[PDB]
Amino acid sequence: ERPTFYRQELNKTIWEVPERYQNLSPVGSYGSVCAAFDTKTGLRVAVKKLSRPFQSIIHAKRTYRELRLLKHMKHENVIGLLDVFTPARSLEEFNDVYLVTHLMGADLNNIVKSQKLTDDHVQFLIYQILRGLKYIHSADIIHRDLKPSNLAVNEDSELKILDFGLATRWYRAPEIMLNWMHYNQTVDIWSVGCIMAELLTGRTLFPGTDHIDQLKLILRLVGTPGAELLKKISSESARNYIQSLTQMPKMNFANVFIGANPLAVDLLEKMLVLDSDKRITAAQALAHAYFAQYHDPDDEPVADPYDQSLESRDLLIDEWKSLTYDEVISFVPPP
Ligand SMILES: CCCCCCCCO[C@@H]1O[C@H](CO)[C@@H](O)[C@H](O)[C@H]1O
Ligand SMILES: CCCCCCCCO[C@@H]1O[C@H](CO)[C@@H](O)[C@H](O)[C@H]1O
Ligand SMILES: CCCCCCCCO[C@@H]1O[C@H](CO)[C@@H](O)[C@H](O)[C@H]1O
């Protein structure tokens, strides 16, 4: 049975939603988001209305990509779908897509507020990110822009990784900062280390003022490339410049993170290595003794493989639109 919808105009735009979704209230901004109450489940939800979903080939492709990812993501620490709907009774009138998920209510700034968390709290939060990253990475997905605003947290400090959240460079791996084009999964591990550091200290690890200051600040802490790492640089210019650099020594992290759990420090040394091939993975981080009170190797699930070649095709608008439509139709709500 097609549910009954109703119109309403929020934050200067019309929203058409099923009746189960009551008390819509804007929470901010590829779409706008309202908090709402789901009378069917009894749950507070975030409802996202996609912005101009089928206006261009590029918008259509993105809508399809977002819809497909979110439908795939089914893990406690990763944002997924409670519902996806359209007013449309058929493909001919299909022009809007609404996405529904748990309202978390806060991201990792509202929960943190620039202060030191306790070690226990830090463990809990980083464990959750890594548990979610393991899941993500097993589907062969690199996040690439992990930061506090891309991490949704509720009151009980239960955390979910967000595709897109509601200073944006402080958490970027050096190789992303330098527009390398062969990233590995440990670009996300770098971002986790920056986040972990800040939760432990109350302070941004690398608050660069601009692009170059950021890299300066990273080199100060991790040192300049060693010889094994220079051997992996294909760009002659990059190579030349690094070789012109005055060798800088890697700092001792026990002196950077004064009074932190020695296991936290050890873990940060394994996350924040210049050479991405030498960074601890999310699976390995989960087994690190720092997360002893939370680690359960039998409840750290992995994803089904995800076909991302389906989203990087070159299709006509009406083809993406029709493919996106079928995804809406095929959607099965979680238990
Ligand atoms: C929905 C649960 C989180 C999934 C994380 C994927 C977020 C996708 O975000 C995308 O990630 C790509 C990485 O492949 C980047 O190259 C893109 O620029 C970015 O748009
Ligand atoms: C002068 C500043 C040096 C920045 C060097 C970044 C080192 C990151 O490490 C490198 O990551 C590359 C991209 O993912 C990989 O191809 C390499 O295997 C890896 O060593
Ligand atoms: C992977 C290595 C990337 C090369 C980074 C380029 C650094 C540019 O950085 C700038 O370099 C200028 C000339 O080099 C100088 O005027 C400045 O001292 C410096 O800030």
Q: What is the CATH number of the domain that holds 218?
A: 1.10.510.10
89 in ligand 2 pocket by Cβ < 6 Å? no
**Does residue 316 form part of some domain?**
no
48 is in an annotated binding site: yes
Ligand 1 pocket test, candidate residues 81, 134, 143, most atoms within 8 A of CB: 143
The reported resolution of this PDB entry, expressed in Å, is 2.4
**Does residue 200 form part of some domain?**
yes
Tokens (6 digits) for 220: 């100060």
* 210, 201 Cβ separation under 8 angstroms: no
**Does residue 89 form part of some domain?**
yes
**How far, in Å, CA of 266 to CA of 245, rounded?**
28
- For the chain, counts of helices (H) and of strands (E): 11, 12
183 in ligand 2 pocket by Cβ < 6 Å? yes
Q: State which amino acid sits at residue 263.
A: L
275 in ligand 2 pocket by Cβ < 6 Å? yes
φ, ψ (nearest 5 deg) of residue 38: -95, 100
82 and 129 in a common domain: no
Tokens (6 digits) for 92: 């001919």
232 and 280 in a common domain: yes
Can you tell me whether residue 98 is helix, strand or coil? strand
Of ligand 1's atoms, which has the minimum distance to the CA of residue 80? 1
99 and 215 in a common domain: no
Spell out which residues line ligand 1, taking CB within 6 angstroms.
Answer: 69-70, 73, 78-79, 136, 141-144, 161, 163
Tokens (6 digits) for 190: 């770098």
Q: Residues 119, 163, 266, 275: which is the catalytic one? A: 163
**How far, in Å, CA of 31 to CA of 88, rounded?**
18
**How far, in Å, CA of 203 to CA of 239, rounded?**
32
End-to-end CA distance of the chain: 19
209 and 77 in a common domain: no
Name the residue among 292, 291, 267, 289 with its Cα closest to residue 280. Answer: 267
* 132, 75 Cβ separation under 8 angstroms: yes
Q: State which amino acid sits at residue 53.
A: P
Q: State which amino acid sits at residue 16.
A: E
Instruction: State the pairing for strand pair 9-10/151-153.
Output: unpaired
* 236, 246 Cβ separation under 8 angstroms: no
Contacts of 36 (CB under 8 A, 6+ apart): 17, 21, 22, 23, 24, 25, 44, 45, 46, 47, 103
Method of determination?
A: X-ray
Last residue of a domain, one of 105, 135, 158: 105
Contacts of 333 (CB under 8 A, 6+ apart): 81, 82, 83
In angstroms, the Cα distances linking 285 to 165, 190, 215, 233, 291 are 25, 12, 25, 27, 8
For ligand 3, atom 8, the nearest C-alpha belongs to 212
**Does residue 75 form part of some domain?**
yes
Helix then strand then coil, % of the chain, to nearest 5: 35, 15, 50
Ligand nearest to the CA of 237: 3
For ligand 1, atom 14, the nearest C-alpha belongs to 142
29 is in an annotated binding site: yes
263 in ligand 3 pocket by Cβ < 6 Å? no
Beta strands in the chain (DSSP E): 5-6, 9-10, 13-14, 17-18, 21-28, 31-38, 43-50, 83-85, 98-102, 106-107, 151-153, 159-161
Burial of residue 100 (number of CB atoms within 10 Å: 0-12, 13-18, 19+): buried
Contacts of 14 (CB under 8 A, 6+ apart): 7, 8
Active site residue 163: yes
230 in ligand 3 pocket by Cβ < 6 Å? no
**How far, in Å, CA of 176 to CA of 185, rounded?**
12
Ligand 1 centre distance from Cα of residue 64 (Å): 13
* 184, 277 Cβ separation under 8 angstroms: yes
Contacts of 299 (CB under 8 A, 6+ apart): none
144 and 82 in a common domain: no
Neighbours of 31 (CB within 10 A): 17
Ligand nearest to the CA of 215: 2
> What stretch of H or E contains 283?
helix 282-287
278 and 201 in a common domain: yes
Q: Dihedral (C-alpha) 220, 221, 225, 226: value to the nearest 10 degrees?
A: 120
**Does residue 318 form part of some domain?**
no
**How far, in Å, CA of 150 to CA of 148, rounded?**
5
